[PDB]
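Q: Could you write out the predicted structure for this multi-component system? I'm mainly interested in how the pieces pack against one another.
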Amino acid sequence: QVQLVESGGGLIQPGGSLRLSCAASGITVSSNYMTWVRQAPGKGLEWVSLLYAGGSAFYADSVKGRFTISRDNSKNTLYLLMNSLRVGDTAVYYCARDLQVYGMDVWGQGTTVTVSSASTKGPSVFPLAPSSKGTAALGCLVKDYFPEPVTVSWNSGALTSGVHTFPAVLQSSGLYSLSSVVTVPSSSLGTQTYICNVNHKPSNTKVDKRVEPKS
Amino acid sequence: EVQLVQSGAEVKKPGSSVKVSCKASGGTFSSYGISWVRQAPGLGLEWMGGVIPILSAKHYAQRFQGRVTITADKSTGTAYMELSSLRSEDTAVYYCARDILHHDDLWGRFYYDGMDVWGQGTTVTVSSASTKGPSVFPLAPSSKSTSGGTAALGCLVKDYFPEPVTVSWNSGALTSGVHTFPAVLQSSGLYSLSSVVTVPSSSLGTQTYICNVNHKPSNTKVDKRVEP
Amino acid sequence: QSVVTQPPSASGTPGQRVTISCSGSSSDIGSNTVNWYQQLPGTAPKLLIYTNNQRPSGVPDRFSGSKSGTSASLAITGLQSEDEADYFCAAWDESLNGRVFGGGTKLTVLGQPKANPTVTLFPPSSEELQANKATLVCLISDFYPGAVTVAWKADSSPVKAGVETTTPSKQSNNKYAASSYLSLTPEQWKSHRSYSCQVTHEGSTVEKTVAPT
Amino acid sequence: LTQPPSVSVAPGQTARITCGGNNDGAKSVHWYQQKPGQAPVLVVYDDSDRPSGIPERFSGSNSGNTATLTITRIEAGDEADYYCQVWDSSRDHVFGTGTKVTVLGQPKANPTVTLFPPSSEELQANKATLVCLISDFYPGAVTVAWKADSSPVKAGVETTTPSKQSNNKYAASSYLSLTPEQWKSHRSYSCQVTHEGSTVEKTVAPT
Amino acid sequence: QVQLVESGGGLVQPGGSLRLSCAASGFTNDFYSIAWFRQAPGKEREGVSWLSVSDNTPTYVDSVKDRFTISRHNANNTVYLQMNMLKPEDTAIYYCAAGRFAGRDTWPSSYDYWGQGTQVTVSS
Amino acid sequence: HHTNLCPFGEVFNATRFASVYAWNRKRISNCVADYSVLYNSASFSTFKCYGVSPTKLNDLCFTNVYADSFVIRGDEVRQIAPGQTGNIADYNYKLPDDFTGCVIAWNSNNLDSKVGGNYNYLYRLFRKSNLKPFERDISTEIYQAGSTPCNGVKGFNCYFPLQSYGFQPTYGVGYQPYRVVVLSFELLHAPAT
Ligand SMILES: *[C@@H]1O[C@H](CO[C@@H]2O[C@@H](C)[C@@H](O)[C@@H](O)[C@@H]2O)[C@@H](O)[C@H](O)[C@H]1NC(C)=O
């Protein structure tokens, strides 16, 4: 009793279509304010749509004309049709019953929608040279790759302590980019060679980039 | 039956503020309004304001509009009433009651239609003066307070603030014939009362009579011997 | 400046019927219901009638309300001793946006007996005079109905300066009590030959007189 | 709706989370708790009501231009994001920006900022990316502002969310995509990282 | 289908004049109404002039009563707002809106069609 | 002449208005008044006529008028129009698609709002279905959202269907009270009268 089970998420190419479901138990969808709320990866909550018990539908400005909310009384399930998707729509979509004055009490577990490209793109690796101005930090820019993940080692794994590989960004282009830095003492920048070994398995990419001080 | 217990009595100085509580009873808020009614000494009832939890609504009476606040914490299920910038005329017993709601569908309104269950009321006193212990004097018996072999002797509890003052005689051993009068409120803001007891005149030379005056606000107890 | 009006008092022989009238306007009884409350002295008011003439549980059918236009009425059949109380009518007036209570109507049941007041007058104590103060105490008890008027006299002349008198209060025996105080200087007390406390109850007056030592 | 980025309260103490806006008298306020990887849970509705089963530590209030959520006797189980939502118009809802209530399990640590200019190899490919890396900050709440010379830049900014690194501190990274002309036109670009009142700024120049 | 075309704004001195135009295109009949809303810096959209087309009846707010004049030319199906004796208070982005009714309203949401705003700046 | 003037006074100038969920209706006939003064009035912030012309109203004659009056929120005036959806248009007052008449509204913040709040005007927030045109709902039955019947028990899915408009002098126009008068004009063909 009292459950909002969602389903229908996944990856979908830009401009595509995808339909979300919200199976209800104990709560009748057709006689409740049912809404859809999405949360971008790491941002706040943005209400998207709603459906009155009387059938009136309303949508947010960021999804008007592209999204459509519906329901099925025999299956007691709330739906959300999504057309002409873009990367801005990539978020975790929730369904919840609204009580207006009494807020939104029951929420679904939430399904994830990822809108990006397909196939597999290998990254472009650029050296992040150490600055000329007691320690120095140098790294490698693993830019524009899909899908995750890439592995970055330094000098074929001979250098581990001090290496800090940062989590990747999901650019609005749908491609990923990350950076791996190793903070070394300044006195060794001239006598030691530093080479990052970036591997992207889905593209069979194996890049070894030498990082020298900027001339 | 339900019960609304309000907070204890209050004594305040003009300009200050008072906040009275009123505990509800279970799910009272469901389909029951709450009104705040005060009653000055010897005067009638005066609606001050109210609240409706189910509609999340509240209203106020013209007289108190602009110097009152009525809140309702539904988690605790209770209401509050705060009156600020108090004046001497605000001295009254402040009541809290649940109001049964009427639905006038002709005009689409929802107002209170009688308050069945009442609170016990909260006495609030406003006076510019502050605390003071009473000066207790004996009211001795003589031939002029004697009638038919019975003598009348008492104690004058003069110039105290605030209420109340309790008076007993001989540590409670004497109860019959005792008549403790309600206190008078002088123009100075202080109170004064008297307590008299009628005893056989033959007992004046055999029994000692002591009045026990207790003014807890000032933490003052006075035991006054009354002799002929 | 109030709108609703009730007669101040009302009398009724026991076992018979009484009518308490409530006068309003178009802003309250014109479109809003009117209810009735009964308050016993010292206690808290209780609901008597609530929707013009609906009775809560615990209210006998001896009480009946009625409403016609801008007026309301409360009827008490078969008067019993416990019915002697204050009766307030009230309605939700919208002009002020709030309930408005009536002025109240005190009911007196005629079965009670009249009682003359017992007056005891105490002169200023020598302990208070040694403190350079003087207070005459006049205690009035066992009088019914609870309504008396007090007057003080210096020698052979009235006086009102320094007089403090309480309102009547119902005793345990259902009679009433009141007290009056006269503050004097230790010179005003010794200068005059006597002081008198006059207690007038139901047209008749009882006077007690005291004199310095 | 405006909410503070994050609050930091000692265990057992009390938090207060503000929610500001215009005309906050008629409209009501609701509060939601979102634990990591969890759906939001309504904790306070209609300003001050607690729904059934939610501890008395939580409480709400609202008047003027500010609503407030009060969490007393804070435990580590309260570490979450808290959002306010108004009861304004029955055609749409708006949420606050959310507030992170870091329950302190270690002292305050200021972030280490490292800014890189676009590599000479990226410029020859007709691209330019400024890399701003933020690490070793606690609590895990930072905001990043970019600057051209001394003017604010908003377009082309991609910033990660704070992630828990090994030593339970947090890390983040911000990227500014630029054209080689925009990078060579101005004299310098800046990455400004704010962490609980303190501000660390790094600047690079086209040389 | 329905389209509102707007033009005529610019920079003028205090006391100058300016003529705004709103060209209605996809209307079957004359049963519609035109309004002019201006959005001052930091303010909301506020109506200043209305015109019931099928009735040719103008309505102006008190602040622009004797200074503004709204009218419609029939063939071009264009409504004009003649603004004389302009003040710095009049500096705002002006919008013209239409609705399938005969009347006027102060609420912008009550109009379903909008043209692109034109800038009116009044300073010295 | 004043044989029978139109008693728009009892409607427009009424001392108090109904709540929208319980809107009033007054039947107007017999008389003959002018609408130019109404339309040319600087007090009506809203004066929208559908299928009819407000200034050419003086030229027309009808059979009956229905004068519907109530109070709503400022930003809800746009719902009092044909083909609108929302809390008011679905659950309180619905105008038909073929509506013939005028919608008149004006700001009443000076009357229907007092310090602290005027928590008297109400509106219907919950309903199982939308209103048919000119349908009126005054029920207070506890709204049921679950499968179990409420039976007068305010439990889980069982709440009150009405809420209070709270009006204060400092609130914005979108939340300030607005009195609305809906005049419905009837049918008539070839007016030779
Ligand atoms: C609204 O009220 C105006 C005020 O006039 C007074 O009230 C009316 C009812 C008349 O009795 C008038 O003689 C009073 O002096 C009126 O002038 C106006 O006509 C009224 N208009 C409407 C539409 O009610």
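A: Regarding packing and overall arrangement: Chains A and C do not touch (no CB pair under 8 Å).
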